[PDB]
DNA sequence: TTTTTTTTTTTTTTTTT
């Protein structure tokens, strides 16, 4: 902006920004649908301040609740709301009321809810008050508030009390029932990760009773009004003073788990009760909430503003209780906590204050240029709290790997934080900064950022059409029990038919209600699925209203995925010995060591035995189990297509336990990881797997933690621990590295399967628990899925695999395969391995697709189509002809874009017809895999085989699709256009490799060569394919052959 | 701005200074 001119053009002055602004919203909340009434979400447009009295601050906010730019209607925030930090194009509710009119929310009137949407914990909030960065760091390093005995106890006792309150607070009941719980397999994992002694757990529980005894002495007694525990309590019903009587008559609900749109709140009311307030010698009943705390009697503000907290959760389900109760099972002492609105107001502002930190986390610094991790909440001067933090190494290390001539942070803590991050060096602190700032932006991508607006807002009918809402349902079915929170569940629709689509049982699913006020309920999986009935299990039992009752059943998504991620980083950071070794092998890139063979580098017994397994493995698979046996560090196992991976890693496994090595074994998937247990159990190779049995494998379920102790009944600490000691060999999957057995147990060896697919952080779980690793994968194939842009571009989807490959000398690849026929693999060969597959046997090389009856259906075709068409369907059916292109060109075969994916049915049309012949022709479906780019052609072809009447064939993309493989595959490319629109998916040179290695004896391709040539993968492929003339280009949609399918 | 997707769930709290 120089001359004079270029100012005077360049005032401006209202539309475009507004829109812009829409935009902004729906990448943060996309689809947020706007309103008035109860639920509203306005948009704000606008945000000024001016100054009324005389130096007093006044928020002036714009908004709208419905597109249509003029409903225009202004807003002022006073005295705290004014700071509220909200800034234009933000979703906010007022839940002050109003919607009828907004204007002024101030002291005294209104709560102003910025992001309602994102619903934020009251434990959280209470956090809060003290600091916030302690709460927002919380909420984003999960696991770094480590269990500890006092919150062990808290729970066992919390659960005693709940069972007791439905029963009988009779002291041997009272002992049966802290007897009972104190056998849990949950609390015993707990007492095993903390190394405790199951019998002082129940002594130190068991002083508690006593008071539980005294309590309901006191409050749930049933006798004289007069003679209940009396306290004044002012309500906002009028009349609060003058003394009162309180009794306790029944627990109506335990552990009430609520969402609220409302605030923006969740939160888990441990007890909800039933309370008789005699007043001289009226009664007033009210539904009350209760929360239950092991801890010392403080009466401490973040007790009490749980409680008036969870008053606001409680509105969502029914009246404004008004009040609530704080217990202290300690002492058998109940006091009252009345929600006022100072104290609901105070907290609102302050959780709107946290809902804004934990969604304002990477910062432009110029609209548009590459990304910064934005800092937190800064570091309190208050130093009684930092003192006992847990979140301290967290916030130290935040702080000096995102930080700011200045500082002027407390000086006090400036030193703490050195102490805490001196072991650490630059190039140490610059990784864990960029691996997060790429963790915030793929969770925060627009994709798992979809708000629960369709469950509370539109009804069940629009959106069965779609997705999951499924429901308008009943069940009358008795609740099974199974074990704690896991209760069985049955439904079915009231009277008639009643559909299914997406509804794939097993499953994440949320049970709602009919009316709004049942919003939420329980979250849980299904089990299974008849089209009349459905079943499917949740946490909670949900027998208060049966019958009359309704239900929406909806689905889920990620994001939060993030936590066990920044964990691992975390862990990283921290100052231990593993760490260190890690940091150095990892971000150092220090060299990976090897030794010498020596005669005695296994011990003498073990040799037999390693020989024997040695001796039925080709030569690159021996060479890879030498690496393994010789290395100090890692090794890198580089499994190219179908070079046996399974096979490989199952007789490494095996060499090792020969070794008497222990073996932490993880992959990425749970059948990756029992692919390779079912080949250890034919093999007799005992080994305890982790996880979640209903996730495993059925032949494997057997060997399942979960099912060892339902079995075997284990319910002594002495018993589980026998267990997790049973076996030298411990297989679970990367994201279960949260097992109590990783806080006492450490490995020889750690394992990892798809190493290459694994995202980084993620894949660096297992590796804290073992000396040593070896990671499986091959980085030609897929890597890791990284969803956006900026974090891809920064390096996200590099796996540690690749990264680590650098170091060759620790890097040995599978080359022998066994999959692909000569003909096939030579494909793959000149396009990707460059020339180092070779053939497992002249089997293998030689071999053809099986179809018996080729004569009859050669005939059977021909009665439509002609003989001499034979280019195409001669060379396509030809056995030997195991590779082969089908040019679309000669025959338009359009695409379809449709909202992001693309179809083409023509190619869709095509490929059906191609299907039917092979299994005609004696090839049974079963063999048989179909393959295209995009999910939206999935569909179409799924369809047109329902339509046919042929659907064992399996239709998926690629990455469905890794590590398997079958007989036939046909691959439509989908993509044919004009000479414009060109996806960035067929430029990736892998997702093309995996196609052209699915296939064992018959690869048969599908496109239109003319806009498929302008990607560089299929450009080479073209060149590939003329050289040996199979592509074979296609008569018109008018010739014989072809007018008959079209 | 070019469409490719699995895991872990009791993910809300359990205390403490
Ligand atoms: N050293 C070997 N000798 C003979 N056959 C092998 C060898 N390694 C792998 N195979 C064969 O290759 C096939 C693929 O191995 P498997 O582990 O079952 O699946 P994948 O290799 O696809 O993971 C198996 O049927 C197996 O018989
Ligand atoms: S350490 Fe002090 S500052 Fe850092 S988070 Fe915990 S409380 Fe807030």
Redesign the pocket.
């Given at each position: 902006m120089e001359p004079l001119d270029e100012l005077d053009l360049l005032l401006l002055e209202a539309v475009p920004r507004v829109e812009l602004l829409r935009k902004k919203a729906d990448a943060l909340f996309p689809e947020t649908v706007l309103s008035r009434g109860v639920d509203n979400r306005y948009l704000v447009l606008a945000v000024e301040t001016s100054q009324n009295e005389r130096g007093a601050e006044e928020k002036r906010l714009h908004v709208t609740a419905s597109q249509d730019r003029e409903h225009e209607v202004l807003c002022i925030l006073r005295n705290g709301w004014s700071s509220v930090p909200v800034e234009p194009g933000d979703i906010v509710h007022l839940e002050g009321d109003c919607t009828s009119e907004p204007w002024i929310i101030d002291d005294d009137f209104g709560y102003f809810i910025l992001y309602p949407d994102m619903?934020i914990?009251?434990?959280?909030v209470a956090?809060s008050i003290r600091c916030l960065r302690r709460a927002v760091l919380?909420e984003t390093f999960?696991?770094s508030?480590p269990?500890?005995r006092?919150?062990?106890?808290?729970?066992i006792?919390?659960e005693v009390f709940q069972k007791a309150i439905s029963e009988s607070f009779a002291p041997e009941r009272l002992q049966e029932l802290a007897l009972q719980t104190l056998r849990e397999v949950?609390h015993l994992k707990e007492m095993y990760r903390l190394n405790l002694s199951q019998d002082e757990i129940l002594c130190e529980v068991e002083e508690y009773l006593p008071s539980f005894s005294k309590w309901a002495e006191d409050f749930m007694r049933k006798g004289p009004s007069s003679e209940f525990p009396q306290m004044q309590l002012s309500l906002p019903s009028d009349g609060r003073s003058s003394p009162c009587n309180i009794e306790v008559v029944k627990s109506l609900d335990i552990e009430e788990?609520i969402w609220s749109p409302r605030f923006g709140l969740?939160?888990?009311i441990?007890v909800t009760v039933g309370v008789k307030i005699h007043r001289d010698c009226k009664m007033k009943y009210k539904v009350m909430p209760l929360?239950?705390?092991?801890?010392?009697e403080?009466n401490?503000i973040?007790h009490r503003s749980?409680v008036v907290?969870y008053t606001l959760l409680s509105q969502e389900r029914r009246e404004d209780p008004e009040a609530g109760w704080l217990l202290y099972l300690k002492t058998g002492q109940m006091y009252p906590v009345p929600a006022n609105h100072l104290d609901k107001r105070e907290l609102l502002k302050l959780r709107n204050w946290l809902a804004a930190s934990l969604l304002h986390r990477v910062s432009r610094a110029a609209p548009g240029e590459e990304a910064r991790l934005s800092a937190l909440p800064q570091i309190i001067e208050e130093e009684?709290?930092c003192?006992?933090?847990?979140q301290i190494g967290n916030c130290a290390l935040y702080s000096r790997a995102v930080e700011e001539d200045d500082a002027s942070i407390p000086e006090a803590m400036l030193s703490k934080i050195q102490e805490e991050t001196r072991h650490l060096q630059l190039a140490h602190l610059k990784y864990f900064s960029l691996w997060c700032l790429m963790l915030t932006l793929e969770s925060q991508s627009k994709?798992n950022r979809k708000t629960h607006q369709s469950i509370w807002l539109t009804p069940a009918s629009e959106l069965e059409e779609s997705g999951n809402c499924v429901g308008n349902l009943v069940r009358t079915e008795p609740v099974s029990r199974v074990?704690?929170?896991?209760?069985l569940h049955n439904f079915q629709r009231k009277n008639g038919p009643m559909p299914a689509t997406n509804l794939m049982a097993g499953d994440?699913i949320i049970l709602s209600g009919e009316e709004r006020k049942l919003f939420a309920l329980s979250?849980?999986?299904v089990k299974k699925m008849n089209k009349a009935a459905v079943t499917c299990?949740?946490?909670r039992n949900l027998s208060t209203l049966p019958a009359t009752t309704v239900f929406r059943l909806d689905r889920?998504?990620?994001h939060?995925?993030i936590?066990?991620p920044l964990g691992n980083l975390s862990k990283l950071m921290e100052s231990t010995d593993p760490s260190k070794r890690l940091r150095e092998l990892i971000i150092d890139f220090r060299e990976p060591q090897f030794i010498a063979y020596l005669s005695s580098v296994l011990p003498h017994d073990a040799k037999d035995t390693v020989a024997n397994i040695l001796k039925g493995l080709n030569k690159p698979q021996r060479q890879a189990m030498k690496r393994v046996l010789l290395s100090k560090d890692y090794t890198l196992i580089v499994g190219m297509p179908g070079t046996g991976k399974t096979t490989t890693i199952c007789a490494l496994v095996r060499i090792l336990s020969a070794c008497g090595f222990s073996v932490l074994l993880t992959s990425?998937?749970?059948?990756?990881v029992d692919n390779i247990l079912l080949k250890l159990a034919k093999f007799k190779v005992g080994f305890l797997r982790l996880?979640?049995s209903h996730?495993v494998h059925p032949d494997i379920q057997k060997f399942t933690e979960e099912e060892i102790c339902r079995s075997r009944s284990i319910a002594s600490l002495a018993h589980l621990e026998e267990l997790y000691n049973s076996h030298p060999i411990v297989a679970?999957?990367?994201?279960?590295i949260?097992?109590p057995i990783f806080s006492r147990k450490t490995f020889d060896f750690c394992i990892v399967d798809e190493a290459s697919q694994i995202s980084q952080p993620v894949c660096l779980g297992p590796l804290f628990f073992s000396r040593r690793f070896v990671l499986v994968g091959d980085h030609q194939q897929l890597p890791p899925?990284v969803?956006n842009?900026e974090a891809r571009a920064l390096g996200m989807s590099e796996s540690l695999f690749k990264r680590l490959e650098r170091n060759e000398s620790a890097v040995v690849q599978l080359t022998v395969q066994y999959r692909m026929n000569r003909k096939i693999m030579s494909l793959s060969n000149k396009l990707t391995y460059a020339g180092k597959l070779e053939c497992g046997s002249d089997r293998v090389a030689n071999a053809v697709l099986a179809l018996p009856n080729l004569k009859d259906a050669r005939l059977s075709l021909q009665l439509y189509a002609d003989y001499s068409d034979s280019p195409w369907l001669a060379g396509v059916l030809e056995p030997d002809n195991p590779v082969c292109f089908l040019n679309t060109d000669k025959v338009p075969a359009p695409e379809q874009?449709e909202?992001?994916?693309?179809s083409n049915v023509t190619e869709a049309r095509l490929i059906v017809f191609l299907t039917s012949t092979f299994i005609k022709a004696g090839c049974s479906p079963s063999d048989i895999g179909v393959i295209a780019?995009?999910?939206?052609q999935l569909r179409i072809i799924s369809d047109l085989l329902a339509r046919s009447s042929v659907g064992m064939v399996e239709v998926?993309?690629?990455?469905?699709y890794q590590g398997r493989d079958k007989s036939l595959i046909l691959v439509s490319f989908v993509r044919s256009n004009e000479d414009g629109?060109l996806?960035?998916?067929?430029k990736?040179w892998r997702?093309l490799n995996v196609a052209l290695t699915r296939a064992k004896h018959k690869l048969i391709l599908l496109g239109s060569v003319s806009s498929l040539k302008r990607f560089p993968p299929l450009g080479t492929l073209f060149d590939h394919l003329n050289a040996e003339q199979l592509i074979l280009d296609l008569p018109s949609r008018e010739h014989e052959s072809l007018s008959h399918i079209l």
């Open positions: 619903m914990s009251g434990t959280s956090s919380s999960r696991g508030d269990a500890t006092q919150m062990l106890i808290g729970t006792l919390h949950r788990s969740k939160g888990k441990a929360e239950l705390k092991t801890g010392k403080s401490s973040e749980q907290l009684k709290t003192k006992y933090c847990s994709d074990c704690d929170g896991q209760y994440r979250k849980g999986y299990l949740l946490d889920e998504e990620r939060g995925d936590s066990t990425y998937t749970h059948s990756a996880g979640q996730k679970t999957t990367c994201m279960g949260n097992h899925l969803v842009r874009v909202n992001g994916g693309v780019p995009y999910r939206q998926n993309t690629v990455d469905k629109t996806g960035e998916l067929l990736d997702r």
